Design a protein around this nucleic acid. Structure first.
Lengths: 191, 141, 61, 49, 75, 137, 141
RNA sequence: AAUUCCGAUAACGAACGAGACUCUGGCAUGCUAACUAGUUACGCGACCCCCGAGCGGUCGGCGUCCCCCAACUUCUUAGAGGGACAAGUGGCGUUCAGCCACCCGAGAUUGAGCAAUAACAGGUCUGUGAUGCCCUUAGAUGUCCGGGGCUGCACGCGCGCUACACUGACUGGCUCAGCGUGUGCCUACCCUACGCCGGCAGGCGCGGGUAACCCGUUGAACCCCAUUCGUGAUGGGGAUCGGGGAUUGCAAUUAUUCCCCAUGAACGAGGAAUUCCCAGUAAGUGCGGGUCAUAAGCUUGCGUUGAUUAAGUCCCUGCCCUUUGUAC
RNA sequence: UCAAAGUUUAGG
């Protein structure tokens, strides 16, 4: 604990980012990664300030959603840690890396801006921002899990793990990874 | 080692069991029939609940002194669904708080203080602080 | 060929509603090359795009 | 620069495309070859630089 | 499409499936056991408290919402 | 455990022994979560059991308490028909009988030509609620 | 002569006043050690300074805290702030400014919260809407 | 941010508005301050019982029993001062006005209030013993009493509340707020501690309180931690409806409100459409004020939990200036 | 590097 900061249980180091681009905006570490995904964390005050927020805190925050869960954070911390446990048992390896790898294969690489185009709407394909790419990746996949975990006997944590695993693996099975592939195809149709 | 030194959830687990084993409380007639506060849909799922809330009430009296029954209804207050209207605070049941504090009166866990209201007695401080010492020495966990 | 490319100079936000930043990008494998092209999101000097195509090069939109 | 690279002929000066347009008034204004002007600024028959 | 109709019993074949199969999984949660079988959930919880007691499964976490259980603890 | 009934038929109703007993009895018209829970505590049953368990003696024990509640100390309040006009009794109506008592009370108000009866007659709201806006059926 | 240091900490309306003293490094808050407070998910928060600086830095300096106001999350960050501020104030006064300097750096690089509080505070609602900013729904047609 | 400045120049030199200002938010181990703050840590003078650790000492924990001839202001209250100025470093900018970044540390930006000219035939005569004219004036359109009505339901729209569950429900347990308000009244009565009686709504006793004194460490909710329950219109939802009981009242039926047992509707996330919002913000979440005998699904304040996304553009909707056209 | 967008008391 004094030399290195664990994430409750798991490790910060030995979490190798693949895509030089998602790197720098994925804060699984600068060196700076904390015990919890909670922190007063006034990152909203400025534009890219957002990036320095550690990705797991962001993932919790993106989980605090659909009105009934708005403001409910400790509720969501518990969900994440249980998913990380579930990812640990299911796959193995650090769940942080499984999250990082999930993030990495989930955000689009190009999208399709709605330009006006006379009046009736036809797009142009444009090529996405690394921060935006991470952001969409985070929300897509958190959202994917939520909508899985409604009306079946399956915990959010359990669903959230299974999406994160079916994301890290390019499964075309995760909501997130599938919705992304369809997004990129739409952009190709107007590239 | 005192009670503040212990995880309060597992303390009242033992205190209630201490209050069962002793077997001289005076759980009243109702128990089965009674609701517990106008809040509630249902009766308590623990059918031996009077032991538990007598325990929880005592441990409160250890921490905060001079607590009347009106104080006790406030501590066991909560949300009240009007159902289709917005919720509000309802205070706990009077009689069951009263029946508890009379039960600790007879046990001599407590004594009604100068300037009104109940406060716990040494012979009660025995039991409360003794059982903390028991819990603390359960295991290193 | 998913070529990476580093943003050298963010020019100005094009787009109908205002969104697509026009960005000039050094081309990583050989930095002599330099396309101008558009980006959805918050962009800044010193980050790396992920161009799929490598030969389109937008201008006004 | 792409064509300068991949031309055979060494150095080489390219060509240039020479077109005389003839914009009518209606179209000239639409495409903004010519803007409108204030009554004074109308009487300046120097070109813009 | 969905119409899920579950069991609430010690019904022989399922109980023998639990005693054989379930202690080999990596994820063992009552929800997961429910979807594996067609076992209710309260049933599934009770089954997974019984296998702990016996000592064929492992406890990972015992939290209010979600309990987590594992493979034997093999070697 | 216990391989027996699973489904039950009590007092014209069809209780799912699939359900847990305390909430299974509420399948009957006139017994609710409160009452059922009281009824089983005077019965002195392990109410954790599903209704599909229970000895056939036990279900008859439960019913007999439900029918004659005050003789097993289910107090005055936990009873739907109190001080009930057609002889001043205080007692819990159940089953089809509950429907029968209701209809008689409406027919009673109807026969008297009272206000409240006329509104039940006309298919309106009887408890003084505003109807310019609601109940559009 | 005793080496006493009373130091506060803030988070919305959560005044946590820590109090260091020459002793044996117990560290309890209100009247109970750090392994309650009892939002519990946020244990590592109210441990952080103890985890970072280690038991050596604390060792001989007992830290009774007191807290009131704010909510449960607010109170944790308050103490977390208070205890780490208190420590810095003990070392400033009754050690030497060089050790303080290193202590301060260790906490800041972790988080600036530890010493420097938020000025963030609850923005007032103005009429025409349920919040500060939110407006009540316009009908138009 | 700005008709804000620089700078141009048939203008010169002014007036309002904007800004300044006022209230507020956050920094002050700096100063002044305290029994209606704390006490604050001492002293522990202790009480105090085994209260606990412990053979016993010494500690750990509060409750308090404490005054004053203990010691102060860290927490508290609120005074009068300080405090940040785009001042510093680097760029960019006619090396002006300025903009960007980073140091120090709050980074010019906390959020309100106030608010010009000219309008509008905007609303208000039902706020006025502000009111002109008109009307009516004893069988009154004056006024008081009794009763009913404003709540009537084929239907159409507007702001709302509850939900459609398991990121949940219920049952226990644990555990933290901040603005307030309060009787002894302009016409008849407040806030309520503690004890008994009652399942409960409540009832009866005595007390305190014109208030940092009492209510009151306001022991709020959501949250957190053990409960079951198991995706079944289900224990989700809580409409409608029968029976009974409380309180307000001179009176409650057309159910005043509150409690209780029962009844258990649509609703399984909402078509075309359209609102609101960028930091403690939305949203969740309770509690105060108002009205108020009775009393909030409204409102106006308060805090507690606390995001996502932007940091831009004129595509839509509008607005500000210039040029322009115009049969308005 | 041009889609469609008609009308507007008698009641002062």
């Amino acid at each position: 604990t004094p030399d290195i900061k664990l994430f409750g249980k798991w490790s910060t180091d030995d979490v190798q980012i693949n895509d030089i681009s998602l790197q720098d905006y994925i804060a699984v570490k600068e060196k700076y990664a904390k015990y919890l995904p909670h922190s007063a964390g006034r990152y909203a005050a400025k534009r890219f300030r957002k990036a320095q927020c550690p990705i797991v805190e962001r993932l919790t925050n993106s989980m605090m959603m659909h009105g009934r869960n708005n403001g409910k954070k400790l509720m969501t911390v518990r969900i994440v840690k249980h998913a990380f446990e579930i990812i640990h048992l299911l796959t193995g390896e650090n769940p942080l890396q499984v999250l990082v790898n999930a993030i990495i294969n989930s955000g689009p690489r190009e999208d399709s801006t709605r330009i006006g185009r006379a009046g009736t709407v036809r797009r142009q394909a444009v090529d996405v921002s690394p921060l935006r790419r991470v952001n969409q990746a985070i929300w897509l996949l958190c959202t994917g899990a939520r909508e899985a975990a409604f009306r079946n006997i399956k915990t959010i944590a359990e669903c959230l793990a299974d999406e994160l695993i079916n994301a890290a693996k390019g499964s075309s099975n995760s909501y997130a990874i599938k919705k992304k592939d369809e997004l990129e195809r739409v952009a190709k149709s107007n590239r | 080692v005192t009670v503040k030194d212990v995880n309060q959830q597992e303390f009242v687990r033992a205190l209630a069991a201490f209050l069962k084993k002793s077997g001289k409380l005076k759980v009243p007639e109702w128990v089965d029939t009674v609701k517990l506060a106008k809040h509630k849909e249902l009766a308590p799922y623990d059918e031996n609940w009077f032991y538990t809330r007598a325990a929880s009430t005592a441990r409160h009296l250890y921490l905060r002194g001079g607590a009347g029954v009106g104080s006790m209804t406030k501590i066991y207050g909560g949300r009240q669904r009007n159902g289709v209207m917005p919720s509000h605070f309802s205070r706990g049941s009077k009689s069951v708080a009263r029946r508890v504090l009379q039960a600790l009166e007879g046990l001599k866990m407590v004594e009604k203080d100068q300037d009104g209201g109940r406060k716990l007695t040494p012979q009660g401080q025995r039991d409360l602080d003794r059982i903390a010492g028991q819990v603390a020495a359960a295991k290193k966990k | 060929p998913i070529k990476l490319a580093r943003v050298t100079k963010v020019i100005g936000k094009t787009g109908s509603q205002g969104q697509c930043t026009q960005v000039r990008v050094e081309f990583m494998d050989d930095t002599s090359h330099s396309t101008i092209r558009n980006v959805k999101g918050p962009v800044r000097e010193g980050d790396v795009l992920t161009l799929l195509e490598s030969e389109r090069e937008a201008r006004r939109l | 620069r792409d064509i300068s690279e991949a031309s055979v002929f060494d150095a080489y000066v390219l060509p240039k495309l020479y077109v005389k347009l003839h914009y009518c008034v209606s179209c000239a204004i639409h495409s903004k070859v010519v803007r409108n002007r204030s009554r004074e600024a109308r009487k300046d028959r120097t070109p813009p630089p | 499409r969905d119409k899920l109709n579950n069991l609430v019993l010690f019904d022989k074949a399922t109980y023998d499936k639990l005693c054989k199969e379930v202690p080999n999984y990596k994820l063992i949660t009552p929800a997961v056991v429910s979807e594996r079988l067609k076992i209710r959930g309260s049933l599934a919880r009770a089954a997974l408290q019984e296998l702990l007691s016996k000592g064929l499964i492992k406890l990972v976490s015992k939290h209010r919402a979600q309990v987590i259980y594992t493979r034997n603890t093999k070697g | 455990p216990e391989k027996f009934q699973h489904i039950l038929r009590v007092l014209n109703t069809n209780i799912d022994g699939r359900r847990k007993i305390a909430f299974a009895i509420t399948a009957i018209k006139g017994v609710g979560r409160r009452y059922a829970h009281v009824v089983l505590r005077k019965a002195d049953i392990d109410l954790t059991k599903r209704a599909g368990e229970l000895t056939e003696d036990e279900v008859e024990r439960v019913i007999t308490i439900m029918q004659n509640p005050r003789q097993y100390k289910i107090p005055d309040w936990f009873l739907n028909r109190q001080k009930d006009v057609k002889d001043g009794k205080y007692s819990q109506v159940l089953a089809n009988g509950l429907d029968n008592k209701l209809r008689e009370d409406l027919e009673r108000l109807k026969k008297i030509r009272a206000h409240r009866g006329l509104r039940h007659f006309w298919g309106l709201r009887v408890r003084g609620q505003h109807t310019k806006t609601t109940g559009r059926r | 002569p005793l080496q006493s240091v009373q130091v506060f900490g803030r988070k919305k309306t959560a005044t946590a006043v820590a109090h260091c003293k020459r002793g044996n490094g117990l560290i309890k808050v209100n009247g109970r050690p750090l392994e309650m407070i009892e939002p519990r998910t946020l244990q590592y928060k109210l441990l952080e300074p103890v985890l970072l600086l280690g038991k050596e830095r604390f060792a001989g300096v007992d830290i009774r805290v007191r807290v009131k106001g704010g909510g449960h999350v607010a109170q944790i960050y308050a103490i977390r702030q208070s205890i780490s501020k208190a420590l810095v104030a003990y070392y400033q006064k009754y050690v030497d400014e060089a050790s303080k300097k290193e202590i301060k750096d260790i906490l800041i690089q972790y988080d600036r919260t530890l010493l420097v509080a938020d000025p963030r505070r609850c923005e007032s609602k103005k009429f025409g809407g349920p919040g500060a900013r939110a407006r009540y729904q316009k009908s138009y047609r």
